[PDB]
Inverse folding.
């Protein structure tokens, strides 16, 4: 009923004590599948489950829906996460009332991320600048009804804090009435155990709950670590390097790595483990088997926004909710102050030339599979077709191919060429006309506020990467599909706006980026003939956005 | 249930002209198939059938499963069921057991059938028990259960039964109806004119009970042809002509077939025959489509099965004709077409005759040899000459265009792929060597087993292995052909059974029988897949210089 | 529950003279012990106690368990509970948390206690929080809960909480009572004349609240003596005399003790003190027996005879249980006075040898003075300690001594008793690997070894219980009072390393003595070795011959 009590019992008995965190899926089908997965995984015997809070809102209704479904109908003990600065007092109160009626008695009280547009920062005027304010609020309005957790950071935090100040701030939050701490994910257990010592020496006595993230896939492992700024031991990276492109092998090794880390934590007397499942069952199950703590695999291996959208695990899962990293100042420092289209284009070309690691829409630095199409990509961007994502055609590379290879060995892998880009409304009609004339191309196109255009008649899923491996069915990690694409549309236009808001209200940069997002089309083109490398670039060869140097 | 008798339901269909139809299902070959079938039966019940039929497995191997399903359908899912039941295949205790189960389930409708007599005849219990013909089962049900069960019997518009003699057939049909059958269900047909003429003949013979036409929707071109040819069932040239342009694309075939069958159904309805009985083959889509076309309406992952090569999780899995039975013709007819083999070489020559297109069917053959065997014909022949008796095969294909005249399938502007595979019988003496050779080549997956022994394989996980797939515009990868443990074991049992049923076409002491029985009791069935689909020949290379000894030895 | 206050229950006892008694239980050390305790509490409630007490674990850790048990007892089993609670050991948040839990459980009676102050008073949060004495907790409960809880406080007839100056003690008792306590519960005693004189003193000081005598039935001779000596508690010479003929047979001891304690109780009842509070030590039998003797009544004897940390860990009664407080007794000053100021390993070794030579009565890890069964192995024990293998506990092999043997005998007569030799000691991490290597070479030895913060090493594959003392008696199953078992050993590990640290903290923050003792506890292994061949006396000492800890005279930096 209260987590602090469950934790106290874990600390006394040393019994198997663990919990699972889930996030709100991006698809309706994902939500239904998640409920099934939550039911199955509850038989592993977690003391409770966490449901994350979507930064801002929109999915507020979904989080509350799911807490109600889990707590009230499925009879799963839930801890609801809740942010404050990204919202207002009415939305906070609404969430608390819903959690109350649902039978939830555990809140993880969080700040969330401050708005970039500080002119429109209601929560701070409302007295919700920090997580401590939410802890205080819950205690004042609901007394002892809710047990309250707070976030702890063994390896520091995004905002500009030395460790001493961070622990002072942690003590403030705990002293407002939080019964436990939940840490951000980590893979350096020595640093974690040192941090625990520091926390106790600061006079913070509440139970500490380590955030454990099992390794489902090499990509999500790295991307989530780098995003959370999270040292991976050289021992681990070394052990994974031989098999990084085979996620079955990665997961097998990671099982042992993470389970060993968990044993070091348990032997240190920290007895409750909090698993970030990423809405997947297998990696968590595997770690629990390794710990001897135990009493449907079709979406085992997600691929960011390119996997099956029916999976609970679908989407780019680097952070707790939508947006760019870094201070407004830092983002102006990395991406400059663009006054026109050409400036944006040059930024993107810098990305393609490996001079910048991250664009606003970039999960990661430019991949090696761009090397042989780099000039064509650069050419598009010069002409103002701002490329967001791409892949080359591949016609049966060996699965150990250093650039193109993935999965187990003695396989062959295939890729349909695709291209995804922003383009001006002036130029879109022509692009449409040209694609429609070539019937072996599938396209999806949409504006921020408009309707989806496509030539796909059925518009079911289209496989654009697949693999043939001994003794196996065809593996299809990369899909282009209507629902996946619309899910991305919303995020992409949002990221553009969050970029715009790194600049001042009247600024050239802001008005430029906002006009772009409100008028430009996001376009995805797939060439279903995977024998052909260049036909997408050929189709787009004459086309240029005019007024590349125009300043608003 | 509720004392509902089909004869009354049919009388009402004939009076009202209301939408009146029923769906036949068969017992699936896999446990997963069974579960999936229950879901499908639930979904399809919303189309509004008056009832559903569940078929009886020839012999009563799957008798427990049929009964399980009738109970599940009638008693738990609340679906009005007619249970099929055979008699000559079984004996009195098994018949009574099935009837008692159908009784307790709340079933009130039986389709009373003979099934196929045993080939041996020395071991024919049912005839000893007085169950030689379906009429005997009709009489039995009436004696033991009175009016509780309404009883259907089989009718044959295009001859069938055991002999097409004609007229004698209608006399025999009248005998069975007069034993106390309330209705007739016909075997499938596609010649509606012949059907309507047959109906006239049936009535003129003084048989007045309601006639229910067996309608088979076209799910796939292959199953359409194979089931028609097996049932000896005239397909109009009109139909064959209209399907030929698109025979290798089953989406297109099914679209055309919707119209063909719906048109046929309209001709039947206009003739005053008002209840349609659909053979679903445990698939929903083709039946749904025909009903949409008639305006009779109020999980497509397995829409396109591929005999024993499709997904074994599908209800529709398996090679689906003649109710699970075995081999088709008279013992005489089978001796006439397959000869009287005295040794291994005789069998080999029979198989080579098959490969050379000189005979259309082997005991293990769904169909005549495909064109995709033409470019590997010599190697197949070579194996059979050396006594590696090939049952099934396919060549490697590395991205043929989907319109390729031999290799192509599915829609256009696609590419299709095949892993080479080989399936064959081999002597126990030679199997150890074959095993040793396969194990040395790690890119080969193999499955091997005897009639009575355990499955050997190098597949560690032994999940499904895709051996035919296709890449089509705007689609996920299509995988019609799978080699999988469950599929293979399902086949093992059937293959060794077919061999024994072949043996029993010959006399008890005969050279042919003792030969075939020794072979089935000792030889291994082996399936080898070359996962490198860039390579055509490595399977044949691996098996070069292996020969079964004593090819001419007569037992 | 039901607003029932103990002061009213006591007033009724005093008016009616009805059978009025209560049972104290403590939080068990084992999960299995907890479950067994619930069963015992259920059974014993049929004896008809007015309520039960649940003790508070000094410091915490088991705070959760105390609260769990109060909830289980009060809320689910329907047993009227009085929850004990300390304050100086804790802080304001933990106190409030405990009170809130007792509140929600339906408890309406608290025994308000100080507990023991930290030895390192630099780290004393509770005193900054305004919780220096029990009176502060009494005041706090009254302020936060008003009349909801009736509050008891501790009384000391024989002068044993911190100081013994009886005048000052009674002044302080009056302060506590006047803060809003409704009753007094005394520490255990066996001198009834002193008790009745004390009551007179209490009343003459102007303290009128009901007094509840703490009665401890005699379960075993060992626990009787150890608890008495530890609480500094005069046992009458009449009692010692009457027990001496049969001290090694606990059945006989318990039979005699039934009469002794029941007679004492009758003297108390005739004096007009009508409610008896029994310290059960989580055992049923001795309390039952006293109640039968008083005519106050209206297998599960498998653990009737515990043996400190050596008995079955599944018993509720398992563990040492000399005090409430999981630490060493006495002022920091007093402890420095008796154990000196050790600067190096040799100093500690000499302290231990002084213990072995009967020159000091108590080491930090010592329940009692050295036993007579050490006499014939004393030189070998001394030899180990000289070499820096600091021995904590030991026993000789015994191969079927008669049960009346003056040194080795125990239990009833015409029996035979057996002991596996065992040795338990602290050893440096430098030397442990060698000891391990040597034990592993001798397969008839079972060992358990562990550090303060490290994992358990052992050669026991199943690692179930190993019997190291047993007895064969006429008409009986084999009696197995002494067991070495994983759970028992880990329970002890934690306590042993804690006692070492509590010793360290008797010295100043920077001091040689403290840094020495802390380094030792944080780095040295606790090792238990059993020689399963009980025909062999000396093979443990042989195995460990020529091992020596280096830097015995080195003084830390
Ligand atoms: C286990 C866990 C779960 C999470 N779940 C979610 C989730 O569901 N949804 C989501 O959007 N995010 C989530 N987050 C992310 C979190 O919202 C971000 O890290 C966010 O930036 C703030 O974290 P916080 O609540 O710890 O903020 P705070 O504890 O307020 O700290 C925020 C910053 O302000 C500083 N600070 C604190 N007090 C003061 C003060 N008095 N004066 C000045 N500066 C101060 C801190 O040092 C720090 O730099 C989660 C994080 C963790 C570790
Ligand atoms: C709608 C339908 C459903 C079927 N369902 C199944 C099923 O679920 N399971 C299964 O195993 N099979 C099934 N069958 C197949 C059937 O069992 C075979 O066709 C079988 O070989 C004949 O069975 P019958 O009941 O039609 O035979 P019968 O009507 O007994 O005819 C059998 C043969 O004996 C002849 N004959 C009949 N009476 C006499 C007589 N008095 N004297 C001499 N000769 C006689 C007939 O002319 C014919 O040649 C079904 C057939 C149909 C049409
Ligand atoms: C019946 C009983 C039950 C107990 N139960 C438990 C239990 O469950 N758990 C546990 O940990 N311990 C328990 N104890 C032990 C108790 O916690 C210790 O004996 C403790 O050291 C003193 O407890 P107290 O409440 O009497 O302290 P207090 O009455 O506060 O006094 C303790 C010492 O401080 C002195 N003192 C008091 N007031 C002042 C003042 N104003 N100025 C100066 N000195 C002062 C006293 O004279 C005495 O020397 C129990 C004791 C008894 C008698
Ligand atoms: C497409 S590969 C990336 C390889 C390379 N960067 C390229 O050129 O595409 C990444 C995807 O493959 C998936 N994957 C890797 N190994 C797999 C395996 N054994 N089975 C299934 N999916 C696998 C991952 O989970 C991820 O979704
Ligand atoms: C996650 S991978 C997609 C590959 C695909 N999922 C697969 O299975 O191979 C992202 C790809 O887009 C490319 N990319 C990233 N940012 C880009 C940009 N701004 N413009 C064009 N291509 C970009 C990367 O170099 C990489 O090839
Ligand atoms: C593998 S192809 C035939 C191979 C080879 N050309 C031959 O005929 O010997 C036949 C299989 O493909 C399936 N099939 C045909 N068209 C299809 C389509 N459009 N979508 C999915 N499966 C299809 C059929 O149902 C059957 O399972
Ligand atoms: C139903 S198809 C199976 C292949 C599958 N439909 C596909 O995806 O191509 C049967 C195949 O086995 C071959 N075959 C049939 N009988 C054979 C035999 N006795 N020996 C060897 N090959 C045989 C046919 O020529 C054909 O290629
Ligand atoms: C708890 S008593 C008795 C243990 C056990 N119940 C028995 O039957 O002997 C512990 C035993 O170890 C001895 N002992 C106590 N402290 C010791 C120490 N520091 N070093 C060695 N032996 C010690 C005692 O003299 C006694 O023989
Ligand atoms: C291990 S023996 C040692 C006694 C004494 N040091 C001696 O040997 O002279 C003491 C323990 O034996 C057990 N004990 C004594 N008498 C017993 C009896 N009659 N039945 C069962 N256990 C008994 C109790 O658990 C007691 O703590
Ligand atoms: Na904990």
């Amino acid at each position: 009923m209260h987590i602090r009590d469950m934790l106290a019992e874990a600390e006394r008995t040393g019994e198997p004590s663990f919990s699972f965190e889930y996030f709100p899926p991006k698809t309706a089908q994902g939500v239904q599948n998640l409920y099934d997965r939550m039911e199955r995984m509850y038989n592993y015997g977690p003391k409770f489950i966490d449901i994350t809070w979507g930064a801002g809102g929109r999915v507020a209704e979904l989080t509350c829906e799911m807490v109600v479904q889990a707590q009230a109908y499925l009879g799963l003990e839930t801890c609801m996460h809740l942010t404050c600065t990204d919202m207002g007092v009415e939305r906070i109160n609404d969430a608390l009332r819903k959690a109350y009626k649902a039978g939830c008695t555990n809140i993880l009280a969080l700040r969330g991320d401050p708005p970039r547009d500080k002119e429109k920062w209601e929560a701070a005027k409302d007295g919700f600048r920090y997580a401590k304010d939410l802890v205080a609020h819950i205690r004042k309005e609901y007394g002892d009804h809710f047990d309250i957790g707070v976030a702890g950071y063994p390896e520091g935090c995004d905002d500009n804090k030395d460790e001493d100040l961070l622990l002072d701030h942690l003590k403030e939050k705990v002293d407002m009435g939080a019964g436990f701490i939940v840490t951000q994910m980590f893979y350096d257990v020595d640093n974690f155990l040192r941090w625990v010592k520091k926390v106790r020496e600061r006079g913070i006595s509440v139970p500490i709950v380590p955030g454990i993230m099992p390794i489902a896939t090499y990509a999500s492992f790295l991307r989530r670590a780098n995003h959370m700024k999270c040292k991976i031991p050289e021992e681990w990276m070394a052990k994974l390097e031989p098999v990084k492109n085979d996620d079955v092998a990665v997961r097998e090794i990671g099982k042992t790595l993470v389970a060993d880390m968990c044993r070091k934590i348990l032997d240190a007397g920290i007895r409750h483990l909090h698993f970030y499942t990423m809405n997947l069952a297998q990696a968590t199950r595997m770690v629990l088997e390794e710990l001897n703590w135990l009493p449907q695999d079709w979406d085992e291996f997600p691929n960011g926004r390119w996997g099956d959208s029916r999976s609970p695990a679908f989407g780019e899962l680097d952070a707790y909710g939508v947006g760019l990293t870094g201070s407004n100042e830092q983002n102006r420092e990395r991406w400059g102050e663009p006054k026109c289209i050409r400036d944006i284009a040059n930024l993107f070309i810098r990305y393609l030339r490996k001079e910048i690691d991250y664009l606003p829409w970039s999960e990661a630095p430019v991949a090696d599979e761009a090397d042989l199409i780099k000039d064509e990509l650069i050419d598009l961007n010069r002409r103002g077709l701002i490329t967001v994502n791409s892949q080359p055609a591949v016609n049966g590379a060996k699965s150990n191919h250093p650039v193109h290879g993935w999965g187990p060995s003695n396989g062959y892998v295939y890729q349909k060429a695709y291209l995804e880009f922003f383009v001006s409304p002036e130029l879109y009609p022509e692009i449409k006309r040209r694609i429609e004339s070539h019937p072996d191309l599938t396209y999806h196109a949409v504006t921020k506020s408009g309707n989806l255009e496509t030539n796909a008649q059925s518009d079911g899923p289209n496989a654009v990467t697949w693999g043939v491996f001994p003794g196996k069915e065809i593996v299809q990690p990369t899909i282009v599909e209507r629902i996946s694409f619309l899910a991305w549309k919303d995020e992409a236009y949002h990221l553009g706006m969050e970029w715009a808001r790194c600049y001042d209200a009247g600024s050239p940069s802001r008005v430029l980026l906002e006009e772009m997002m409100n008028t430009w089309w996001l376009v995805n083109i797939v060439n279903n003939d995977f024998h052909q490398g260049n036909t997408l670039f050929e189709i787009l060869k004459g086309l240029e956005v005019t007024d590349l140097d125009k300043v608003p």
Observations:
- The longest strand of chain A covers residues 417-423.
